[PDB]
Symmetry: none
């Protein structure tokens, strides 16, 4: 028996308290799916949704956050055909779409005007039971633990989509800015899974961490005077691709500076008040392409999922209770993002 | 027949001034080819040859300017296979290349470390007889007036390469900034050849010229305070691709502003002191691609040349001598608006 | 005598052709003053409040616009010190200010945090009786035409302060972009009143107009190919000052190009999504200063009205009713010239 | 004790290898003065003189470079009325001026048309004996170390002049971008010497150096995602002035972003391919002024030197031989300085 009440984390207003409180269990729409989310991931966007910094409008309306959730389908709608009860499903950033849009008929559904967003426009994965469109829902393979898939739902798909947006060939050099973070570690693992020579740029103790994951090179801004020259000496002309994972505005310009001739620099993050200038003369002469990578489509999601399923990508995670999620948000204000943290909805 | 003197313009060092004086005939390289230039075009990169301002080291030694030139092959070198004597050929920006470099083997020769640039590292098109690599040369079909071919070798090719860097499908809307200029008059026509709905942004009443080159709609900076708003209103969300021919920094920033989501913004020129900012947030959300377009490849060259051959492109041009071409040149140090300027040796 | 219902133009909605409508006469403020406005001016900023274009949010409440109003005080209001019934007064863009801010003690009141703006924050001059703070209200001299003082309330003070911000010496060259516009004609007359050599830049048949205003020579973007070179030729190295009235971005960048070494380029307009780049090399070597001029101080206001009273400044206007002012609103979004407009409240 | 031959570092061609040659000692003009240059500073401007990248032309191609030199006067010309042999003298970037130009009467000699520039048009301080105009030469006090005064001749005077162009009062906040560089350290010390509150923006926490120089707050691009917001928090609305030493483009637009209302943003360097855009709306509403500071005037130079004399400003330096100067030129064509290099023209 589907329950009638659940535990969720709800903030009524921007900046307001997250509440571990009892709320009604959602009942699914005709095209939706009801998922007992057992584990949910926390990316930093949830703090930006809470702050309201994005020009977009959060539902507020007592919103439950979350865009990365793994669970089991417990109820299906009337017009849902391909899903069966007991299947594993994922709540992604793209909750639903119009599906007959210019952007929706293309391969990129999240850029539709009538997009429904988990944790922004719709109640997200921080609750025990969540509703998601069956068409945009994730097919998670049985025989892998949902705890490990939860970070893949946003971080794995995004970093994989960025590497694919680089249009890089096997053997080329890819540079990962901010490679010591969780997103960066996943970028390193995915790039090695695509047969790419990996160069890693970040400040601090990450020199050991990247090699822990297999990264072929690491560079420290703390010790290295000019990143451009050092990178271009280690890559013999610049990296064929650059992934700007750090949101600091200076690594973006450095990436644009040290990228190889005909190289591709992709922005991945969604930061505020950050701009990347570049000399038109050098952009034309080197024919570099600055590409923006948004959230991936279902096909990219399925690829990224298969990478973890086959064992190419493994991200260590710290499991925390839904009650303790409040503390987690505090860490995000202080930039204490700890690897990848996943929440057990039961606790 | 060949002469032993050829009327060209050479500097001895940086900062010196030209002259029409006949100079010794350049020997042919073994893979090179000697072409008698019948007509030659003039772009501002030749204006940038002087003063040594471009960061890439230049032939401070004696150097002949000029890059775009159409003429007849009078002789070749030791090893050449596909060329026949008497054929019509064109010299472009890329004179020769490493031919086995990473960037040269990929298919993009202009990007080698050992690139030869006509009018920078070899004698250009401002001479009567010039030597250029046969593998990087133009192949002109007979029956086409050379006066009209000269602008295709540089401006037409650059416009075609820019339009193909947009990766636009038949039917999308393309916005061209600086469409009243020569680069602009050419891009509107090349875009119309692709089945592209053309939107043009230029200042003044160069509109009628645009509109009647086949463009759907025209936008005027004088009239509009916000080009972005009008452009996004006329295209229903922004153009799928934007080609930046104007070098003003504002059109660059506007191009990134009014471009459609999943759009393609292309830089074309070799502009000094130009910078294109873009907010990372909107580039990521719109999944925008800001790409830089350099010279076209041999295949792109032939596509543009065949567009000239088949009658889809029509270009106004103006014939003046090499002997009598420092007036228009200095006028252009002041960026004199000049119809395509071709150089008839005679 | 003073009615209880008045004719006015109010757009409760941002984007509505606002209807000539009867509204309640405003309740007199405690320290404020009630002014029967007999003539009111129309500036392009009035359109932007209607458009909702400005990042600064206008009053989401019923707003009757206007920042330039000339009238007679019909009720004095409490906490007023020197205002007397029968005095002539002017409603400015700055309706009131905190008067005890870091910037308010600095002598520049419009940059206070608690600033109230006529036609934006408080009900403006398009109504029969309007409320304004006594300290920022204009002292218009009795015996002087109200129709003609109305345009000075926004254009005269602003262009005069811009010329003050050019910090130009007697005999120096000033170049005025958009000199044929409403702002521009006043700029030419004020600059000639301060002993400056006027150069005028505008498109079309306006050359005789500007030269009749006292402009020494005229340059036309329509006929002249390169404005920078021609201006530098007319001035022997560039104008000592430039005033950018047109919001077109081309003249702003050209102004930074052709301004003389050690020159001063002053921005005046309030445009949308328009940026001014400048080559760091050339701005440093030429030591040019790009300075922005916002609303004038009370001292600047009285200086400009002094110019009008003594006859140095003459404004041309077509007196129109409040009716058919929606025609001119459409004309302003139409990107089109119609001439300076002053409205008689009676009609 | 004047021989007829000296040691100098000369390059006959742009890009030529500089040579430690013996060359004839220059013959002093009647209005010139001959200074045994004992110490000479090396800033990146000399490297741009060598490259010929600047739009101007080192027209002396047979050229000994150098714009900052400290030495003893060993000979004067016929028209040198007030200088004495044994006095200390400084070779500044501005070697001489016409003294009858508009810009020369205004007090700004470097913007003269007939200006001769040390290390560019006239032989500079890289030689043992150098010639400089007696009117434009710097008066260094006897009893001060020439090695330490030499960097003030270019860095100290320039940062002092920029801080002067800010026209800031005692107690206001000034923000220094690139505060960890040599220019940055000098401006921090000068700004403290004028009674300002210094805020410093640069890379690394090793910049406790800035806190030692007197900077009141410091912000790190590494740690802080958005510098603008944090700076405005630390200054309660933005710094009253900004001094842009870094030529990176993003810091220049960021400086324009976070500068307080009615503030002054000053550009200082002479970079290539650098440009500062700014939104006209915010420049007008905030009345921000983007001003460029070129080299200082003689009054500015003596004001700056008095400060070193009194001990408020100190420039740690690495002393290198005149022979080794080629190494210094080699590094700067590649990347920035590791410190203020000064040449003992004895070695
Ligand atoms: Zn996320
Ligand atoms: Zn859609
Ligand atoms: Zn060309
Ligand atoms: Zn090659
Ligand atoms: Zn220096
Ligand atoms: Zn002078």
């Amino acid at each position: 028996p589907i329950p009638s009440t659940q535990k969720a984390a709800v903030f009524h207003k921007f900046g307001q308290r997250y509440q571990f409180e009892k709320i009604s269990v959602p009942e699914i729409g005709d095209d939706d799916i009801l998922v007992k989310v057992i584990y949910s991931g926390v990316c930093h966007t949830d703090i930006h949704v809470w702050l309201g910094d994005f020009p977009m409008e959060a539902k507020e309306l007592p919103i439950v956050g979350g865009h990365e959730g793994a669970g089991v389908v417990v109820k299906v709608g009337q017009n849902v055909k391909d899903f069966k009860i007991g299947d594993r499903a994922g709540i992604k950033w793209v909750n639903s779409s119009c599906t007959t849009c210019e952007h929706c008929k293309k391969g990129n559904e999240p850029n539709c005007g009538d997009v429904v967003l988990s944790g922004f426009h719709r109640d997200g994965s921080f609750q025990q039971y969540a509703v998601v469109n069956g068409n945009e829902a994730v097919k998670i393979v049985d025989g892998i633990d949902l705890v490990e898939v939860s970070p893949i739902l946003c971080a794995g798909v995004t970093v994989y989509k960025a590497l694919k947006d680089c249009n890089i060939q096997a053997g080329d050099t890819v540079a990962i800015t901010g490679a010591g973070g969780g997103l960066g570690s996943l970028c390193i693992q995915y790039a090695k899974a695509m047969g790419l020579r990996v160069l890693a740029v970040d400040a601090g103790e990450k020199q050991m961490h990247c090699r822990h994951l297999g990264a072929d090179m690491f560079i420290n801004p703390f010790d290295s005077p000019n990143l451009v020259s050092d990178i271009q000496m280690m890559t013999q002309g610049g990296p064929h691709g650059v992934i700007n994972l750090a949101t600091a505005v200076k690594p973006m310009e450095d990436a644009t500076h040290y990228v190889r001739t005909k190289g591709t620099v992709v922005l991945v993050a969604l930061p505020k008040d950050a701009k990347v200038p570049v000399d038109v003369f050098s952009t034309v002469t080197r024919s570099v392409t600055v590409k923006g990578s948004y959230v991936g489509s279902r096909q990219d999601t399925d690829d990224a999922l298969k990478f973890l399923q086959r064992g190419q990508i493994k991200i260590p995670i710290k499991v925390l209770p839904l009650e303790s999620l409040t503390e987690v948000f505090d860490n995000m204000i202080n930039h204490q993002v700890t690897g990848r943290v996943v929440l057990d909805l039961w606790k």
